[PDB]
Amino acid sequence: KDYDAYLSYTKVTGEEERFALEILPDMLEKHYGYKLFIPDRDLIPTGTYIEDVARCVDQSKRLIIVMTPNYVVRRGWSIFELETRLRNMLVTGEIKVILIECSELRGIMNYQEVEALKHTIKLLTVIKWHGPKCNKLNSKFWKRLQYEMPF
Amino acid sequence: KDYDAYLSYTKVDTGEEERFALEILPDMLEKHYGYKLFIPDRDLIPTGTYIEDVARCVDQSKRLIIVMTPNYVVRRGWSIFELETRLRNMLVTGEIKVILIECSELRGIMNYQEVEALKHTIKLLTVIKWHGPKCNKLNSKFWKRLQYEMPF
Predict the structure, then answer these.
(1) Counting Cβ atoms within 10 Å, is residue A61 exposed (0-12), middle (13-18) or buried (19+)?
(2) CATH assignment at residue A145
């Protein structure tokens, strides 16, 4: 409805950081022309924060999870499992999720936890980001992401 | 059934709230009060069934203890309970009582709000504020309150 995609990332290394905070958003908005909802730019944390996130996600055509190392450590995806309506949206397939992997999941628990997150998402697509080489304009990474986005 | 409480905590890679969470809290409940706890770092071996094992171990406990230190808040140590369908149900439908021990002074609109939401997902809930090391002294108002919230 309102946005092409809701960007979900954590910001507290180096390449992964520049990718999630700059390259990814710039490519999507300035190169492809998508309209993103970026919390750090568009969301005012207030007393209805949890409700505002659920609403804004519902108003997005896609939910993008940028799984960088810090995102795994801080479990930046927790809110999507915490908020009842969001979790149901995920399980029911009301939300199409694009999970971009930017970290080799080191650790039994992290791996199984992430596996469990994926299993709660019906309309999920995972895209691997191998590194800076994937940043080059028109790379297989970008072609795949473009395909997964709306329009 | 099998345990009096499942201890949910987080541990970094300093020694005040983490001292309590890892050392004092467990020793006091087991040595002094004689409770039987399920402590992951001691009784849980992570495998391909880790998620289901936690669900099963929690279900085998009379209480879920969440030790909310700043690290637990930063790492969102409570996530697995909202992620695993069965665990989340236990909390929402009240199949298990949760004793949430607030060690940190939760600051930041987002963390505060996420914690508020976490609490709203728990039907059977009790919160105990751990002001500081002073609450660690034998038979203090803190220990009296905790024992009361425990089984037996």
Answers:
(1) middle
(2) 3.40.50.10140
